[PDB]
User: Fold NAD-specific glutamate dehydrogenase from Mycolicibacterium smegmatis.
Amino acid sequence: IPLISRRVEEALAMAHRDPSHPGQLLRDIIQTIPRPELFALSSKQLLEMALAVVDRRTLLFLRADHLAHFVSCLVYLPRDRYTTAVRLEMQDILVRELGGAGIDYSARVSESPWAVVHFTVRLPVDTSLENESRIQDLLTEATRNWGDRMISAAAAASISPAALEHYAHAFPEDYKQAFAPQDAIADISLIEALQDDSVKLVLADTAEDRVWKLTWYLGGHSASLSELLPMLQSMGVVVLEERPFTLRRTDGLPVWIYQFKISPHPSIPHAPDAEAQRDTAQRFADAVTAIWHGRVEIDRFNELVMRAGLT
Amino acid sequence: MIRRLSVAFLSTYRGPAVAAHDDLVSDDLVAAHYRLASMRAPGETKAAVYPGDAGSGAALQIVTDQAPMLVDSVTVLLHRHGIAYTAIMNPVFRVRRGLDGELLDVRPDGADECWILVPITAAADGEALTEATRLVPGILAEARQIGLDSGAMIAALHGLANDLATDLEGHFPNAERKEVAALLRWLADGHFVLLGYQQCVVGDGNAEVDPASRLGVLRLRNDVLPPLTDSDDLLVLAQATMPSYLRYGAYPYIVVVRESPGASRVIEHRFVGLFTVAAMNANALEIPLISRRVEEALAMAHRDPSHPGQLLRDIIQTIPRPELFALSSKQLLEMALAVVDRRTLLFLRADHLAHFVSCLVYLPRDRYTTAVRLEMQDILVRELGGAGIDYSARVSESPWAVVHFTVRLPEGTAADSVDTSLENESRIQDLLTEATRNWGDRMISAAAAASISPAALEHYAHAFPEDYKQAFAPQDAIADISLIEALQDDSVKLVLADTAEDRVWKLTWYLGGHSASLSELLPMLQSMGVVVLEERPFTLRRTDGLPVWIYQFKISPHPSIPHAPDAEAQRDTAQRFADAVTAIWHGRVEIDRFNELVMRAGLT
Assistant:
C-alpha cells in the first residue's frame, strides 16, 4: 500500500534509532494490526504504539470507531502466559463487557516479552478509561495460573515468604485442579497448624439441602478409608463420598486430606439457626477428634451427640 | 566531586523505572569505581564487584575504552549467567590520563572512556557474579577489536564482492558469481554484522588460517575452523561453535566463499557474524540467491497441475531464513512436498560442520504451549543426543506455529554420526504429534480403532469430566467407555486387576445409574477378608444421559489370604470374587466373615 509503506518506514527510522527496540520485532508486532484503522494513524501515532513497548500484568486499550460499529481492542500480556483458551475467555470477556455481536482477532507473537492481539468487536460506546481498566483486570486473572492466583491471595496473608514459596510448588497438581486459588490460603493455614499424627476437622454445609461438606486433615500419617468411616458412621450421618489428597509441608511433613460429602440420617434434627449449626459442628469436631485419638468406643450411642445435642 | 559523576549515570538509566533515583546510586558506589579506575591501563577493561553497603544491593562497576555495544554484551553476559540486574547505566566520559596509568580529568582533548555501573539485586549467587566479573574484560576487548576493525571488515566485504561481480581471474568457479556478489552487497546494506574475518587456505582436506587477514574477534580467538567449502560450492553457510557474547540469540553464522588462485591452492574467505533483524524478516524474494532457487522450484510447482503456486509459496515464506542456503531447489521440492503431505511436521538437516542440527517443527497454533516447547526440546535433545538447544518462537495468525530449534552437538562429532535420514526424521516427528495431543483427542484417536458409534464417541469426548481427564490416560478411555456403555439401570460391574506393587490390588467398581455412599459398600468388601486401602470416586453422564459412578479401589488382602500360584488361579479367584460381590450388592447373601471363605478355600 503506498501511504502505508510511507508511515511504516517513517516509524521504522525511530525504531532502529533506539538501540534496544528491534526492527523486525515491532515490524511483526505491526503486520498483524488490521487494515481499516491503518489510515487514521500517523507515524507519531505509530511511535505511540512503539514507545508503548518501552514499558507481569495485562494492559488493554479501547477506542470507539468514528462509526461506532466496531470497538478496536488491544491487549498486552506475558508471552509465556497466552493460550488459545485465554484468547477465548478474553474474547468472551470482551464480547460480554462490550456487548458484541461478533469478534475477530489477529494473533501476533514473537520473541517479544508481551504477546499482542488486536480484537475488533462487531456492534449491532462506553470507551471511558474508567470502564477501560476494569475489564483490563478481567484479563489479568484470565491469564493467572492457579499457583500465581494462590500466591496473590496470600499476599494479603501474613504468612512467611519462605513457606509461601515452598507451598507454591509443594501443592500437588490434583489439588490445583480440584480446588480454587482462594481455598489455598485456608488450606495452607490449617496445614501449617498441624502437629505430628494430629487431626483437625472442619465442617461446613455444601451448596445443597441436607448435604454437608467435612474436611479432615490428618497431620503426619495417612489413614485408610477402611477405619475412619466406622467412626463417622457412628455419628448417625450417612457418608456419601470422599476424595483424598496427600502433600508435603513447609517442614517436609506429609499431610493427608479427606473431603467428605455427607448427609445425616433423616431422623437427625435440622438446625434452627446458624448459631445452632455452629455449636453442633464444634461439638462434633470435639467428639470425632476424641474418636480418632481413641478416647471413646465406636457404637451408635455416639449418635446421641447428633440427636440430643450432647458432648 | 562526587556529584557530577552520579548525574551522568542516571541520565542513561533504562529499564531492563527512574524511581528511587538516589536509592539505586549512592556516593559509595561512586567511590568504588573511582577506586577501580584509580590506576588503569590503555585498552584495559577494569571490572570490580562492589558488594553493597547498608542500602543498595550488590553492584558492578567497569572502566574501559568507549567501544561499540559494550552495554549489549554486558546484558547478554548477565542473562546467559542468570544474573538478576535491577538497573544499568553507561555514562561515557572524555578522560585525559597520565603516562603511568592515572586519570587526571573526567568530563562528559583527551580520550573517551565508558564507566559502567549495574546494581544487582541481593538475590544473586556469589560464584556466577565472580564468573561474569572475570569474563568482562575479554569480551569487552572483543567488542573493542570489532569497533576498530569495523571499516576494515566492511571494505574486505566490498572488495570480495567487486571480485565476484567481475571475477576475471578465474578465481571463483561458479555461475552465481554475480548473484553471490549482489547478496554480499545486500547483507552489507544493513543485513549482517561482522564480528571477525579470516582467510583460510585449503589443501589435503585441511584448512590453515591466514593470520594477517584476521580482523575483529578472530584476532583474539585461536579457532581455526575446518574446510567449509566442497569443490563446487562458491558459497556456504555454517554456524559458529562459539557464543558471540555480543548480542542475544543464535550463535554466530560463518559465511564462506571459496576462491581458487592456482590449480593446487584453495583459499576460503571466512566472515563470522550475525543476522540483523530487519534482514531476518526481509521478503524472501529480495535475497539474490534465494529468489533464484525459489523460482527454480516454482517451475516444477506450476508443472504439476494439482500443486498450486502461491499455496506452496505461502508454505515457503514462513520457512525461516538461516537454513535457506543449504537447500538447493532439488531439496526445495522435498521441503514443499514434505509440507504438502492437524499433524506435526518436522525437518532436519545436518550442518556442514555437524555441530548443530537445524530442526524445524509445524503444528496447529491453538496447540502450542511453552510446555510443548519443553517436551519437544527434550524429545529433540534426547532423540538427537543434544548438549544444548535453542529456539526462536514464531507465531502469527497463521494456522501452524513455527519454531526453529538449533541443537548444540558435543564438539568432536562428524557429519556422519548425524542420522539426518528421513527415516529417523519422521519417527521423532510423531513424538511431537502426541506431545501436542490433548487427552481428549488422544482418546478419540485410540477409539478410532474401536468399533463404537461416532455419535457416542462425540458425546463421550466432552461428557468425560475433567477430573477423569487428569486422573487417567487417553488409552484407558476406550475400556472405560465400553464398560459404561455395557451398564444397565442400577447395575453393577466389577473388574479386578493387580496394581504395580506386591500384594496390592486395584478394583474398579462401576455403578450403573445411581450413586452409592462410601458408608455401605465397604462392609461388603471388608467381609471379603481383604483390607481396603483407598478409594477414588468419579461421576459422569452416559451417551444416553444415564449418570454412572466409578469407584477405584487400592486394596490389599489380609496376610493370611493365600497367594496365586499362576495367573490362571488369580483369574479364577477374581471372577468368583466378581460374582460374589455382585451378589452382595444385589442383596443375594448376608454380610459376615463367612464370605471370607471365598478368598481362603476358593469357593463360590
Summary: Chain A is about 40% helix and 20% strand. The longest strand of chain A covers residues 237-248. Strands of chain A lie at 59-61, 70-78, 102-108, 114-122, 198-205, 212-219, 237-248, 254-264.
